[PDB]
Give the backbone structure.
Amino acid sequence: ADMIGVKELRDAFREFDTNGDGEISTSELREAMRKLLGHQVGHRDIEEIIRDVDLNGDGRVDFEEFVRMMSR
Ligand SMILES: [Ca+2]
C-alpha cells in the first residue's frame, strides 16, 4: 500500500540489521557507524545518538526512529 519513498530507507535498515530483528541496537548501530566511519574512538556518542533520537521507550532505533534520523 505504499510506493517508492520510505522503502529505500528499508534498504538501509536492512543492511543495518546484519542478523534479522528489524531493530538497530547500540551493538548493531556501532557496527553500522563502523562500516561508514571506522577507526577513531568515542562510543558514548553512539549511544547518545540512539538516546536523543526518540526511543518511544525501547532506548533503541527502529524503522520508525530510523526514518526520522535519516531525513534532514
Ligand atoms: Ca525509538
In short: The longest strand covers residues 23-24. The chain has four helices and two strands.
